[PDB]
C-alpha cells in the first residue's frame, strides 16, 4: 500500500515541514524588508530637506509604528504561530499585545491625519494652516492618544498555565464586555477611519482629476497615498474580521479543525507585518523622490 504510505508521509512529515518553512521564510522576509525599508524612509526624509513635507513627516511616523510592531511584536507572533503557546512570561504577555494594539492605533491615526491634511489643502483650502511644526504636535498627539486608549487591551491580557505550558489570552469576567469592546475596537481602528478616508480620497480624486505644476505634484502624492490606504485596508481586513467573528459572534470555539483556525489566524497576523514591509516598497514605485533616495542607498551600502 504505497499510495497510503505516501499520504501519511505527506500528512505526518512533508506538509508540516513545508508549512514551517513557508511560515518562517515569510516572517523573516517581512521582518528584514520592513526593518531596512522603514529605516530608509526615516533616512530619505532626514537627508533630503525638500521631502520634509507634512505628508512625509506623517509617513515617517507610520514607519515608526511599523518598526515598533516589526521589532517587538513580529518575533513574538511568529513563536505563537509555531507553538500556539506563550514563551515570554507574564509581564511580556501584557506588554507585547499592548505595543501591537498601540502600533495599529498610531498607524490608522497617522493615515487619518494625512487624509485630513490633503482634504483641507485640496478641497477646502485657507481654513486650516498646516505646517511641518504643527505636524510634530499632531504626531505627539497621535502617540499620546494611542498609548492611552490601548491600556484596556493591556488590562485584559493574562498568561495562564494549561504538559505544563502557558497561554497568553484575554481574560473577560463576563460574556457582554468582550462583545462591546471588540465591536468598538473594529469600528474605531478599522471601519470608521477607513470609511472616512475613502470618502475623503474620492473627493480629492474629483478635485485633482476633474497651479498646473502644483496640481501635477499633488496628483502624484494623492495617487501614492490612495494605494497606501487601499493596501492598509486589505492587510488589516482578515485580522479585523477574524477578531469580530471570534469575540462578537462566538466563532471558532469547536476544535474539529483547530489547524484550519490556526492557519487563518497565522496568515492574518502575517498580513499585518507584511503591511510594514509594503509601505516603503509603495514609496519606491509611486514617488520619484523616495525612489532617488532608495537608489542612492543601494548604491552606497550595497
Ligand X SMILES: COc1c(F)cccc1C(=O)N1C[C@@H](C)CC[C@H]1CNc1ccc(Br)cn1
Residues of this chain that bind ligand X (CB under 6 A): 73, 76-77, 80, 96-97, 100-101, 104, 153, 185, 239, 243, 269, 272
- Does 126 engage in binding with ligand SOG (CB under 6 A)? no
Q: Which three cell numbers stand for residue 223?
A: 495617487
CB of 236 to ligand X, least distance (A): 7
Q: Is 58 exposed, middle or buried (0-12, 13-18, 19+ CB in 10 A)?
A: buried
Using the minimum distance from each CB to Na ion, give the nearer residue, 97 or 178: 97
CB of 63 to ligand X, least distance (A): 17
Annotate each residue in 186-205 with x if it binds ligand SOG (CB under 6 A) or - if it does not, as one string. -----------------x--
CA–CA distances in Å: residue 291 to residues 51, 118, 125, 142, 249: 12, 22, 29, 28, 45
- Does 107 engage in binding with Na ion (CB under 5 A)? yes
Is 243 labelled as part of a ligand binding site? yes
User: Is residue 174 within 8 Å of 92, Cβ to Cβ?
Assistant: no
- Does 123 engage in binding with ligand SOG (CB under 6 A)? yes
Cβ atoms within 10 Å, residue 297? 17
- Does 110 engage in binding with Na ion (CB under 5 A)? no
CB of 209 to ligand X, least distance (A): 34
- Outline where 48-161 has alpha helix (H): 54-68, 74-83, 89-122, 132-149, 151-156
Among positions 275, 278, 293, 294, the unique one binding Na ion when judged by CB under 5 A: 275
Q: At what angle do helices 15-47 and 74-83 cross, to 10 degrees?
A: 170
Q: Among 231, 225, 229, 234, which Cα is nearest to 287's?
A: 225
Coil, helix or strand at residue 190: helix
Residue 155 interaction partner, one of Na ion, ligand SOG, ligand X, none, beta carbon < 5-8 Å per kind: ligand SOG
How many residues belong to the chain? Answer: 302
Among positions 38, 65, 94, 235, the unique one binding ligand SOG when judged by CB under 6 A: 94
Find the angle CA(15)-CA(33)-CA(193) to the nearest 5 degrees: 95
CB of 275 to Na ion, least distance (A): 4
- Does 250 engage in binding with ligand SOG (CB under 6 A)? yes
Find the angle CA(153)-CA(155)-CA(157) to the nearest 5 degrees: 75
Q: Measured on CA atoms in the order 191, 194, 197, 198, is the torsion positive or negative?
A: negative
Using the minimum distance from each CB to ligand X, give the nearer residue, 43 or 75: 75
CB of 27 to Na ion, least distance (A): 15
Q: Tell me the chain's radius of gyration from C-alpha atoms.
A: 22
Among positions 39, 53, 130, 183, the unique one binding ligand SOG when judged by CB under 6 A: 183
Annotated binding-site positions for suvorexant: 243
Residues that bind Na ion (CB under 5 A): 66, 107, 275
Residues that bind ligand SOG (CB under 6 A): 10-11, 15, 87-89, 91-92, 94-95, 98, 123, 147, 151, 154-156, 171-173, 175-177, 179-180, 183, 203, 248-250, 257-259
Amino acid at each position: 500500500s504505497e499510495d497510503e504510505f505516501l499520504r501519511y508521509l505527506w500528512r505526518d512529515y512533508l506538509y508540516p515541514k513545508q508549512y514551517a518553512w513557508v511560515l518562517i521564510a515569510a516572517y523573516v522576509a517581512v521582518f528584514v524588508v520592513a526593518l531596512v525599508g522603514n529605516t530608509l524612509v526615516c533616512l530619505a526624509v532626514w537627508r533630503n530637506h525638500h521631502m520634509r513635507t507634512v505628508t512625509n513627516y506623517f509617513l515617517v511616523n507610520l514607519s515608526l509604528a511599523d518598526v515598533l510592531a516589526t521589532a517587538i511584536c513580529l518575533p513574538a507572533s511568529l513563536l505563537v504561530d509555531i507553538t500556539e503557546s506563550w514563551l515570554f512570561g507574564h509581564a511580556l504577555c501584557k506588554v507585547i499585545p499592548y505595543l501591537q494594539a498601540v502600533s495599529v492605533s498610531v498607524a490608522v491615526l497617522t493615515l487619518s491625519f494625512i487624509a485630513l491634511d490633503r482634504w483641507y489643502a485640496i478641497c477646502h483650502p485657507l481654513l486650516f494652516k498646516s505646517t511641518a511644526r504643527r505636524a510634530l504636535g499632531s504626531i505627539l498627539g497621535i502617540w499620546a492618544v494611542s498609548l492611552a486608549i490601548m491600556v484596556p487591551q493591556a488590562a485584559v491580557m493574562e498568561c495562564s498555565s494549561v504538559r505544563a505550558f502557558s497561554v497568553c489570552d484575554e481574560r473577560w469576567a463576563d460574556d457582554l464586555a468582550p462583545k462591546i469592546y471588540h465591536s468598538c475596537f473594529f469600528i474605531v481602528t478599522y471601519l470608521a477611519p477607513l470609511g472616512l478616508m475613502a470618502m475623503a480620497y474620492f473627493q480629492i480624486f474629483r478635485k485633482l482629476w476633474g497651479e498646473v505644476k502644483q496640481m501635477r505634484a499633488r496628483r502624484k502624492t494623492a495617487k501614492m497615498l490612495m494605494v497606501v490606504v487601499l493596501v492598509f485596508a486589505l492587510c488589516y481586513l482578515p485580522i479585523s474580521v477574524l477578531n469580530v467573528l471570534k469575540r462578537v459572534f462566538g466563532m471558532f470555539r469547536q476544535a474539529s479543525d483547530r489547524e484550519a483556525v490556526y492557519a487563518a489566524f497565522t496568515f492574518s497576523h502575517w498580513l499585518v507585518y507584511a503591511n510594514s514591509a509594503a509601505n516603503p516598497i509603495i514609496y519606491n514605485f509611486l514617488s520619484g523622490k523616495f525612489r532617488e533616495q532608495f537608489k542612492a542607498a543601494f548604491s552606497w551600502w550595497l
